[PDB]
Amino acid sequence: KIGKTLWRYALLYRKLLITAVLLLTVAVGAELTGPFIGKKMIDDHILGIEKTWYEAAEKDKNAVQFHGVSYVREDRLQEPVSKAKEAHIYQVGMAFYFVDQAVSFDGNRTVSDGKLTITNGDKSRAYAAEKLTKQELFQFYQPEIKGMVLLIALYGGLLVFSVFFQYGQHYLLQMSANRIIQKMRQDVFSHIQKMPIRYFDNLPAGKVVARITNDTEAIRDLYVTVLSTFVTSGIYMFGIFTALFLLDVKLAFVALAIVPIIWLWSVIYRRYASYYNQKIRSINSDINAKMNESIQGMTIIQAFRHQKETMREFEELNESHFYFQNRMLNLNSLMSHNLVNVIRNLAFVALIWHFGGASLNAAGIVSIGVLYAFVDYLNRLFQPITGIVNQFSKLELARVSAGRVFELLEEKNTEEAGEPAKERALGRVEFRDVSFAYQEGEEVLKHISFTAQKGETVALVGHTGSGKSSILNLLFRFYDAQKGDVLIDGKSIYNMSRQELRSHMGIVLQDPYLFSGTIGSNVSLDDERMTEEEIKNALRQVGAEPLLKKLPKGINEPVIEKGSTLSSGERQLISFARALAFDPAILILDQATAHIDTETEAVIQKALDVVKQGRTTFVIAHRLSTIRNADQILVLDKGEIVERGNHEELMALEGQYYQMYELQKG
Amino acid sequence: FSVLKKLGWFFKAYWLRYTIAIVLLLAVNVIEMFPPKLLGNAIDDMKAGAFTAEGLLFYIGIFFVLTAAVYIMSYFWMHQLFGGANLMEKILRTKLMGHLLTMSPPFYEKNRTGDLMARGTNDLQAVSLTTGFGILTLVDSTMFMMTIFLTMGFLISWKLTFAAIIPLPVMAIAISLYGSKIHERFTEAQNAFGALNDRVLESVSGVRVIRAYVQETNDVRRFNEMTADVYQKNMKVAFIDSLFEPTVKLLVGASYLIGLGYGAFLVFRNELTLGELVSFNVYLGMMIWPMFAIGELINVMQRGNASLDRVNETLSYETDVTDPKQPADLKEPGDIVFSHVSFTYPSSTSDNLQDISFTVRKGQTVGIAGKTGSGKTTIIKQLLRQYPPGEGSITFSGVPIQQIPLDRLRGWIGYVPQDHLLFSRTVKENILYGKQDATDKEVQQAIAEAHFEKDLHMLPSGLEGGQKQRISIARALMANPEILILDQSLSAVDAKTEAAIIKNIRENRKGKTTFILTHRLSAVEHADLILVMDGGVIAERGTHQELLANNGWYREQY
Numbered sequence A: 001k002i003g004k005t006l007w008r009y010a011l012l013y014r015k016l017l018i019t020a021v022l023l024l025t026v027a028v029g030a031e032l033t034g035p036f037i038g039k040k041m042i043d044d045h046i047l048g049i050e051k052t053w054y055e056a057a058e059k060d061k062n063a064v065q066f067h068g069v070s071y072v073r074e075d076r077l078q079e080p081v082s083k084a085k086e087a088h089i090y091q092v093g094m095a096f097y098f099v100d101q102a103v104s105f106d107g108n109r110t111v112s113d114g115k116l117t118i119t120n121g122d123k124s125r126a127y128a129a130e131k132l133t134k135q136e137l138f139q140f141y142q143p144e145i146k147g148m149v150l151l152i153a154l155y156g157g158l159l160v161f162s163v164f165f166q167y168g169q170h171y172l173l174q175m176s177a178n179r180i181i182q183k184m185r186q187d188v189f190s191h192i193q194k195m196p197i198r199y200f201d202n203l204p205a206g207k208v209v210a211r212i213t214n215d216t217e218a219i220r221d222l223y224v225t226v227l228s229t230f231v232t233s234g235i236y237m238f239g240i241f242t243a244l245f246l247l248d249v250k251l252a253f254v255a256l257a258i259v260p261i262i263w264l265w266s267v268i269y270r271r272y273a274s275y276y277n278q279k280i281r282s283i284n285s286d287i288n289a290k291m292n293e294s295i296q297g298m299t300i301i302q303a304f305r306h307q308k309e310t311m312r313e314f315e316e317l318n319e320s321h322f323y324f325q326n327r328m329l330n331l332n333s334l335m336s337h338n339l340v341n342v343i344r345n346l347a348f349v350a351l352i353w354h355f356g357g358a359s360l361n362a363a364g365i366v367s368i369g370v371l372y373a374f375v376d377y378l379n380r381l382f383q384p385i386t387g388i389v390n391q392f393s394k395l396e397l398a399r400v401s402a403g404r405v406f407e408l409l410e411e412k413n414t415e416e417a418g419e420p421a422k423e424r425a426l427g428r429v430e431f432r433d434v435s436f437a438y439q440e441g442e443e444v445l446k447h448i449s450f451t452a453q454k455g456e457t458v459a460l461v462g463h464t465g466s467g468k469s470s471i472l473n474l475l476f477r478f479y480d481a482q483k484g485d486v487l488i489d490g491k492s493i494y495n496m497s498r499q500e501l502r503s504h505m506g507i508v509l510q511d512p513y514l515f516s517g518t519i520g521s522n523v524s525l526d527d528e529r530m531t532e533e534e535i536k537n538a539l540r541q542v543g544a545e546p547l548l549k550k551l552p553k554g555i556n557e558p559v560i561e562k563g564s565t566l567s568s569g570e571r572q573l574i575s576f577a578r579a580l581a582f583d584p585a586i587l588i589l590d591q592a593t594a595h596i597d598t599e600t601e602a603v604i605q606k607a608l609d610v611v612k613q614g615r616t617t618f619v620i621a622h623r624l625s626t627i628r629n630a631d632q633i634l635v636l637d638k639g640e641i642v643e644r645g646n647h648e649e650l651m652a653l654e655g656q657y658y659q660m661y662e663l664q665k666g
Numbered sequence B: 001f002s003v004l005k006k007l008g009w010f011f012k013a014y015w016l017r018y019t020i021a022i023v024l025l026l027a028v029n030v031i032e033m034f035p036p037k038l039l040g041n042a043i044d045d046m047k048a049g050a051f052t053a054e055g056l057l058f059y060i061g062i063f064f065v066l067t068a069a070v071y072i073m074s075y076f077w078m079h080q081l082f083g084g085a086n087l088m089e090k091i092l093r094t095k096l097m098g099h100l101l102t103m104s105p106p107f108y109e110k111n112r113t114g115d116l117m118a119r120g121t122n123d124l125q126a127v128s129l130t131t132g133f134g135i136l137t138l139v140d141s142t143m144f145m146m147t148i149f150l151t152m153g154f155l156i157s158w159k160l161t162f163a164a165i166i167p168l169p170v171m172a173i174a175i176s177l178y179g180s181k182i183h184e185r186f187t188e189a190q191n192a193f194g195a196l197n198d199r200v201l202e203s204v205s206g207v208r209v210i211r212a213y214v215q216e217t218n219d220v221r222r223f224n225e226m227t228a229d230v231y232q233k234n235m236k237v238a239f240i241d242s243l244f245e246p247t248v249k250l251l252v253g254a255s256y257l258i259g260l261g262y263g264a265f266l267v268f269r270n271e272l273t274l275g276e277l278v279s280f281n282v283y284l285g286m287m288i289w290p291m292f293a294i295g296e297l298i299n300v301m302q303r304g305n306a307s308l309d310r311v312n313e314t315l316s317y318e319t320d321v322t323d324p325k326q327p328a329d330l331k332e333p334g335d336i337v338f339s340h341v342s343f344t345y346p347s348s349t350s351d352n353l354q355d356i357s358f359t360v361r362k363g364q365t366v367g368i369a370g371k372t373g374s375g376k377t378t379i380i381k382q383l384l385r386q387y388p389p390g391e392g393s394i395t396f397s398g399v400p401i402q403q404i405p406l407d408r409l410r411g412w413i414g415y416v417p418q419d420h421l422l423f424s425r426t427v428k429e430n431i432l433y434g435k436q437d438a439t440d441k442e443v444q445q446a447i448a449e450a451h452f453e454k455d456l457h458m459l460p461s462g463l464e465g466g467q468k469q470r471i472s473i474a475r476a477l478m479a480n481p482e483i484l485i486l487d488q489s490l491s492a493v494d495a496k497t498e499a500a501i502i503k504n505i506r507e508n509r510k511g512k513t514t515f516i517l518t519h520r521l522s523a524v525e526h527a528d529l530i531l532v533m534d535g536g537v538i539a540e541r542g543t544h545q546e547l548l549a550n551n552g553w554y555r556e557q558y
């Protein structure tokens, strides 16, 4: 499935891939024609002197005047003199020997009394021969000079030509990869906005960030590897193999016999490297964890004199890690490049065997040009092996990361709904013996039935683990009640879009979140839909906070550090300011501050008083002192509303409020 | 190139292995210099008249022999060098961890955990890479390029050599410049990706608010924009990254065609031969590498020097905060006294203690009360030798703590910090932690006398509010300290468990000193000596009875 999805995302942007492939093909074609130019230069011009020569006239018709007689090569012949006048130029040792006579056999050569004997092991016809000094040879080589120049030009021309296409393709491919990843990223984030709240509750916030970003990076590396290395190497090897077959078919098959070598090498190297690398990484993770847990909280390590044992464990880890590093080194020292050099020298030996075998046969021709072409092609062919094997071993991590991202994408149980609200809530809200269970067969709220009037400050006060926060979750539809029913102004909550509902309400939580950025954007949550109504902070208070430095309507940015520098009281203050700025109809206060301080909570009380006005407020708190004025308190036990009424009515029977108010003081 | 000068100890300790490695490297280079020449000679001899099966067999044999020799020698010198690098990593890890163990809290206040973990995870890799691979590349770039150059010069020709090596220097220079600039752009792109990764955490941790205010579309827009920024950075990197293969191909093709063309020109003038031409081609083919080797060497050397000059600081320059001296002859602590102790934390100009004076007898229980931040726990720090002695005198029966061995002093005391420091081992190891795993039986007692074996019965042994505190106090009691110190040990449980706990500890520890720091004053009732600490001084001191006959001091609960 991973391969299918990767191919599907690659199919997008297929124009870039097609263009890059074509450019790469042209570049490789030119780079590999170069050696044909070199081979022709060598053979057809240097070794063409050994080809026959025929005497002719002297009108510079491709002829060279040896002493007083002009000759022309057979290739540059117009049949003026072909059969009677046949000349040759052999070379024995370092000397070049001109024979002015026709010949029949060809084999080993020696000169004893000027009679160049060509034995060949069958019979030796001795022909008188001369030496050509050092300048006469030049005169037989002079004409070819022009041809070579042209050939040279071609090389250079093609060379610079080829250059441009490489830069063309490597770029495009990269872009392709990057672009695909970008698309992928967007998709995942979109899906994140459609998952239920459960998904986030039952999984740490750290892992989802990793899944969104680091796994996308791993897939990007996978794409870069695949394209740039594998496709390029495949095309390059196919081109080299085409060239070799065009040159000589016999050695082409021998050179084709190397592919199983690469196959087996890659298989074995992967088989061992995967295991050793896995052990190394696990041990390094353990070492880092041990070092961290020791560096933190070392006071008891020193107090109880545990230094020796911790050092013992650390050295055990160190010994194992060092051992596996050495094993990986052994594997490398037996495959990484030594095997390449062995194969390279073995190829040299094979070339020598093949060509020297033909030479001794006395029938085949050495054709040094083909030798040059093959050495060049094999040097280019043996280059990409180490990469190929390394990334082949490494592919597995990326394959697992891609699997993870795709199983994330393919989730089915998602939320699909969205629209702005079209009417003002009016704050009527009712409950109908709702009963919600978080996971299963364990009920946290049972038969919760109540009604809240337009009068605000309807607090829910109970005990720890009594099922108060679940009311907030059911009210914002973060979770479905699974039983009963909830009504907003006579309209069912479960018959309308979630965003529309959340548009009617507001929330303040225990930990006010301070998004990185400026205050103005933070107060408006970078909505951009609202004008300078952030001045609503004033309604809370001023406290000279804008006067301390710059302004908080997009002019001050003290939140870049998560708001740690700002006081916690100021954090809740900006939370209330945002809640009022959005100006909802129903306000829910989830406050569980562990210390009033009796100094920093006056501002919170004032903000609650100023914001609760003209709304329907639910105050989720257990202080029972700021909620003295509530129009209606509600106390529930183990998920059931045991008692309900006003503070005065609930003080008609002393009970729970009595115990709290009495034992809490001092 | 000073890293090798700063690592003299390692090479002096491991000199034989590196000597073998370098000798094998030189021998391998020389022996590997032949095969191109052998092929050149074989080609040059095929053309000539004389060539027999003997030459064929000889060439095959010599090629195989040279191949085997290079294979084995390469294996062995790589073994030696990379094993040396691994040993360097091992040694450095041991040194760093030991030094970290032997330090005191003040050192950890100046140095953040991130830097130490970096120096234990990054600098070591760089230094090991310097000792192994930088030396490998030095050997190559210095000798390999010289031997190939002087083999081509003397065996083949000098005009051809000088003419065909012109492009390689500029190729290397261009590679170096590209490497520097691409590293800069890569750092920029990595910074952009980090900036992206910061935003996703905020938009995923604060999911409730975003959905509550239907702001997910704005979060989508912001994420898409930052992804576009990351893409632009990546393309700016790829702009420079796509310049490696063109330059290398162009400037190697130039050298190869100069070789071929000008060598054919010389073959016409008869100074060269065909065999020499192919040998020259192969020599260039193997000469391509030192160009890259030079840049690799420079980069690794600079990185290694940067890492090492930094590791030596937090591994050597720091001196232990507290130092023992000639051990004194004392076996057990008689009485603990404070003679006008004055002390200030290193990282603050506030006193936190102003000539505190009191005394403690054997079996004496001392109670300390006060408000938060009034130097309640600073006094105990003045006794655990976690900071410089400062000023004053704290004599154990008549001798200042300075003479008591640090090993001996830790043996007497039993610390229970207010914070929860429980190591991620099994519960059994956490409690044996104090005893250093001497025996198993008294663990069940230790927990029973802690009256918290009930909690153990209500949890499966392994892994791992008040559970941490009970485990910590049990661990402290394992060692049977002669001076037991509790620093708000029982805060989660109040007036129901802690009372019986302290009663049982007091009755069990009868002739042993005990210190109780606690915010609640109900739990220090039986303490025959109680002190109230306000600011840097002690406002009042006396028995619990006297307390009742003094200013009402946070007794406004019962």
Ligand SMILES: Nc1ncnc2c1ncn2[C@@H]1O[C@H](COP(=O)(O)OP(=O)(O)OP(=O)(O)O)[C@@H](O)[C@H]1O
Pocket (backbone or CB within 6 Å): A201, A438, A439, A444, A462, A463, A464, A465, A466, A467, A468, A469, A470, A471, A592
């Ligand atoms: N997402 C959740 N998944 C599973 N169980 C949950 C979830 N949220 C809360 N619970 C559990 O359901 C019960 C409801 O308790 P609730 O969160 O309402 O506590 P509370 O009375 O509001 O106290 P506090 O405000 O201190 O958290 C508890 O057992 C709680 O741990």
Ligand SMILES: Nc1ncnc2c1ncn2[C@@H]1O[C@H](COP(=O)(O)OP(=O)(O)OP(=O)(O)O)[C@@H](O)[C@H]1O
Pocket (backbone or CB within 6 Å): B345, B346, B347, B348, B350, B352, B370, B371, B372, B373, B374, B375, B376, B377, B378, B379, B418, B487, B488, B517
């Ligand atoms: N790590 C420290 N570095 C510097 N000064 C410190 C440090 N910890 C505390 N102080 C200073 O010492 C005083 C507080 O001492 P300490 O925290 O030991 O007493 P305490 O807070 O009353 O004890 P407890 O934490 O048990 O309530 C304050 O004046 C404070 O500024």
